[PDB]
């Protein structure tokens, strides 16, 4: 079905195509959903870089992840605060993906914009009290404190995405994240401040993913977990290293930590689900790597190898 | 770009293809986003009708709109309450669209599932008090009482979709909806009950659209407006008639109304934006048709002809 391309083109998420042969990656195609979501007609944006949606309040770390990914010819999934032409604000989960036809590497770039404004505002109001049956059905797979997905969402997605990865021969990578000296932060600074530090770390981790299937969840009271698909070994090592550095650059003053700032120990394990098809083995390996990452660096990512 | 089909296939909204040559319209294709959103692997659903997501609490009017649209070989946009395989609940805005290749009418059907759970729960909590800067930025284009889009969203979309319709030679149809004897409902029953009747009518109108670009907005205190694209004259007459009948079937007891139940006067006007390119003319024509619909039937849809 070739018309399927044209019918999916008329979607509710923005679809943009940008030429990579030309400098600054100008937008070469814009669907109807993009103009409806942003207010910018196609005649106004064709041949221009899509940074007009950004303003001075944009997350510098997310835009930097976009730039690095495009220079390294790698996909990325970021959540951005974009402004429409009228001046209104909408939260955009942008997925960038290269286009490679017969080794024609990165001929163009695919940008899928999804209006996630309601999700951001609702999840932010979840840590406050703010009863409703439909709200409780939503909170089943959402942690109230951080607003991220819960351990149930991780384990269910682990089964689903394992079957999907074994079909397309894609890798499955699980990152076990633990806060260092968290009991010292709760005893000295306070338990409420530890919850505020949990939110700040959660908000920092829940961005700058590599692909749309990837996500972060809160596994324990101080533990987080990230699931990623289709990453090589080098990309997994860089992604895990940069995550530990991002929490370090937050520089939340921790008196109990010998480093002076709260850090993150990361232990990740990558596996090919098509070979062994053994679930929960990756989590066990990632938890053993997290244990090794505690004493090895206490502010580092250790791969179970 | 032919790989663009495969890259868009890996989206965050579910993509399903169903064969129409076979009875009950069995699902013939399922993307990764569908299994992640619903928990149903492809091996479990291929060759089956997608009604397994529905349960006894599903909106009967929305499922009936799906059935009628598929039998009439027409697209539809409905919001449904679907259940995942694990038992959790997610709100699904499903867009169905036929596939016609070289007059190969309705060879298959395209089903795009979009998780709009957060949007439903947030907009429902908007009529309650429930401050936040980001929430106020969202409430710019949202009416607090009904939860629908506001008059600003309608007028801006009217400019955007007018340019889009003139590009693809698509029709633009505007429906002017007004509540009959609304002051009699507020005086006798009460102003609060009139607001509850506004929500019930708004919740009924904000569903069972024909295409993903269509929407409903609250134009005035008792006035609603619907924008639709690509509808013929017969489809616009049936859609406007069925909307007046849906509010009538709600049967909210109105003592001041001679019919015994509150009704809806509808005055719609369809135009081809490529010809005249005169905005606000359709709204003026639709408002004159609404005035004629008041005295002509008081519970009918009148087309400005
Ligand atoms: C196809 C494509 C679509 C894009 N769409 C958006 C967008 O919708 N919102 C946004 O904030 N950035 C978007 N960008 C990213 C910006 O255009 C820009 O490349 C990014 O901000 C990095 O550039 P800069 O660091 O020089 O500002 C898109 C990029 C590409 C390639
Ligand atoms: C391609 C396609 C995808 C569908 N996906 C869903 C869905 O995700 N959720 C849902 O409630 N109904 C979905 N449906 C509609 C149901 O499969 C079914 O056709 C509809 O409920 C009407 O059938 P019924 O009245 O006999 O139950 C889909 C239909 C088609 C053709
Ligand atoms: Mg710890
Ligand atoms: Mg009236």
Numbering used by the authors:
A (entry chain A), B (entry chain A): 4 to 133, 138 to 312
Question: From the publication, what sentences describe this entry?
Answer:
The pyrophosphate was apparently copurified from the bacterial expression cultures, while FMN was added in excess during the purification process and Mg2+ was included as part of the purification buffers. Visualization of symmetry mates revealed a parallel dimeric assembly of MsLadC as the biological unit consistent with its in-solution behavior. Proteins, Interfaces, Structures and Assemblies (PISA) analysis supports this assembly with a large buried surface area between the two protomers (2785 Å2, ignoring ligand contacts) and high free energy of assembly dissociation (14.2 kcal/mol). Overall, the structure reveals a characteristic LOV-dimer interdomain interface, comprising the A′α helices and the core β sheet of the LOV domain. The buried surface area of the inhibitory interface in the dimeric assembly amounts to 3073 Å2, as calculated using PISA. S7C, the MsLadC dark-state crystal structure superposes well with the MsLadC dark-state SAXS envelope (χ2 of 0.999), confirming the crystallographic assembly as a functionally relevant inhibited state in solution.
The blue-light sensor used in this system is a light-oxygen-voltage (LOV) domain, featuring a canonical flavin adduct upon blue light illumination. The name of the latter domain refers to a highly conserved sequence motif in the active site of GGDEF domains that enables GTP coordination and eventually diguanylate cyclase activity. To establish this pronounced activation, the enzyme exhibits a two-stage activation process in which its activity is inhibited in the dark by caging its effector domains and stimulated upon illumination by the formation of an extended coiled-coil.
